Amino acid sequence: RLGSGDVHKHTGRNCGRKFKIGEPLYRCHECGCDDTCVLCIHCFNPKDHVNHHVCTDICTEFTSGICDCGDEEAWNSPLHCKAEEQ
Amino acid sequence: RLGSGDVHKHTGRNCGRKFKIGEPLYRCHECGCDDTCVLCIHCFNPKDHVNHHVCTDICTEFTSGICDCGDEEAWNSPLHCKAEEQ
Ligand SMILES: [Zn+2]
Ligand SMILES: [Zn+2]
Ligand SMILES: [Zn+2]
Ligand SMILES: [Zn+2]
Ligand SMILES: [Zn+2]
Ligand SMILES: [Zn+2]
C-alpha cells in the first residue's frame, strides 16, 4: 500500500492549471522571471518566499492563462510545490 | 443535515492558532495595523490582498505568537477567512 497524496500534486510535469473567473493566484517579484509568471493557490508555497514581495491576483476575465509551477523557465530559484508536501 | 466545514473555520472568534517551529505564515503591509499582525496559512485569503505587499515568514523559534485572523484590532480592512469559504 501507499497512501494517495494531494489531487493537485504534479511531480514530473508542469502544473498547467487553467484559472477560472474569480480564482485567486500568486506572483512573486523576486522569483518570477517576468510579470507573467504565476502560481495557483494549490502550488504556491509560502516557505519559498520569505521576505520576497508577493502579490496576489484574481482572474477577472476568460484567459488561456495557466499556473507555471514546475516550469523551470518561469522561475529564478527552485520552488517546492505546496501540493507535494505531505 | 448540514455538511461540516473546514476544521480551521472560526467564525465568531479570533483564530488564535499558535505557530509551530517550521510553520509558515503571512503578513500584509497594507492590512496589518503593525508589523506584528499575522495570518496563519489556513486563514490567509489571497482574495483580500490583490496588489498589496504580502510577505511570508516561517516560525523559527518557540513563540507564544498566534494568528490574528478575526481580531479586528489587528487589521485595517475586513478580512474574509479562507477557512470560511465553502
Ligand atoms: Zn499550480
Ligand atoms: Zn505545483
Ligand atoms: Zn519568491
Ligand atoms: Zn488563523
Ligand atoms: Zn481565519
Ligand atoms: Zn492586505
Side-chain angles (χ1 to χ4, degrees):
Chain A
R1 307 287 199 284
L2 181 66
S4 285
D6 195 274
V7 302
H8 305 99
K9 176 178 174 175
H10 61 88
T11 313
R13 62 181 176 84
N14 63 301
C15 174
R17 179 187 191 77
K18 192 183 155 173
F19 300 104
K20 303 140 163 97
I21 291 172
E23 185 170 357
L25 60 136
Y26 290 87
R27 310 172 184 279
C28 175
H29 177 254
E30 287 87 348
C31 287
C33 288
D34 65 34
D35 66 7
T36 75
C37 298
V38 297
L39 295 164
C40 78
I41 62 178
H42 311 291
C43 289
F44 177 83
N45 188 342
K47 296 174 187 167
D48 284 327
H49 308 287
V50 171
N51 272 312
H52 282 174
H53 183 156
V54 165
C55 185
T56 70
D57 210 345
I58 293 170
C59 171
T60 47
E61 272 146 31
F62 183 40
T63 173
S64 53
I66 65 179
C67 177
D68 300 299
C69 190
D71 180 350
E72 294 176 30
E73 302 195 309
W75 308 108
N76 289 319
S77 322
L79 301 183
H80 305 82
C81 180
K82 189 177 72 168
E84 220 174 84
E85 293 192 326
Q86 296 175 14
Chain B
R1 307 287 199 284
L2 181 66
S4 285
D6 195 274
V7 302
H8 305 99
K9 176 178 174 175
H10 61 88
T11 313
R13 62 181 176 84
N14 63 301
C15 174
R17 179 187 191 77
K18 192 183 155 173
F19 300 104
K20 303 140 163 97
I21 291 172
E23 185 170 357
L25 60 136
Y26 290 87
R27 310 172 184 279
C28 175
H29 177 254
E30 287 87 348
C31 287
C33 288
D34 65 34
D35 66 7
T36 75
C37 298
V38 297
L39 295 164
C40 78
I41 62 178
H42 311 291
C43 289
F44 177 83
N45 188 342
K47 296 174 187 167
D48 284 327
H49 308 287
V50 171
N51 272 312
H52 282 174
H53 183 156
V54 165
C55 185
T56 70
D57 210 345
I58 293 170
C59 171
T60 47
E61 272 146 31
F62 183 40
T63 173
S64 53
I66 65 179
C67 177
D68 300 299
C69 190
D71 180 350
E72 294 176 30
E73 302 195 309
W75 308 108
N76 289 319
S77 322
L79 301 183
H80 305 82
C81 180
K82 189 177 72 168
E84 220 174 84
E85 293 192 326
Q86 296 175 14

